[PDB]
Amino acid sequence: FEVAFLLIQWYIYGFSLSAVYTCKRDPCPHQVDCFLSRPTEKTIFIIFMLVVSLV
Amino acid sequence: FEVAFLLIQWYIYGFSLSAVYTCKRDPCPHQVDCFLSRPTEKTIFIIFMLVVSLV
């Protein structure tokens, strides 16, 4: 179960969060920019949870 | 002078006006949509001025 959850988390999100995201879904126009909320702190806690999972 | 002005007006604008224009200039994002103001009436008057010019 641990290795399955680690593989799914790598496949969906990766192990970082970018501050600027680009969106191409209807019913928006061609391409819009969307800005996340505190991505640095979430990157730090994602790295901590990854380390705990590996241990 | 008449044929020069007709050639310049054909080269810049054409002889119609579309109701939806797409814009790709800085400092906007990737592509935005911009909507004109009464383009049908302006198309009609452009056709009248073209006919008067040719006559």
Contact A16, A46 (CB under 8 A): yes
* Residue whose tokens read 């010019």: B53
Are residues B31 and A32, on separate chains, in Cβ contact within 8 Å? no
| Residue B30 near chain A (CB below 8 Å) | yes
Are residues B33 and A31, on separate chains, in Cβ contact within 8 Å? no
Experimental approach taken: cryo-EM
Contact A35, A22 (CB under 8 A): no
Question: For residues B46 and B1, what is the distance between their CA atoms, to the nearest angstrom?
Answer: 18
Please give the resolution of this entry in Å, rounded to 1 decimal.
Answer: 3.3
Residue A36 main-chain phi, psi, to 5 deg: -75, -175
Which of B37, B55, B38, B49 is CA-nearest to residue B10? B49
Closest Cα of chain A to B36: distance in Å? Answer: 17
Pinpoint the alpha helices (H) of chain B.
Answer: 2-12, 39-54
Residue B34 main-chain phi, psi, to 5 deg: -130, 140
Pairing of strands A32-35, B20-23: unpaired
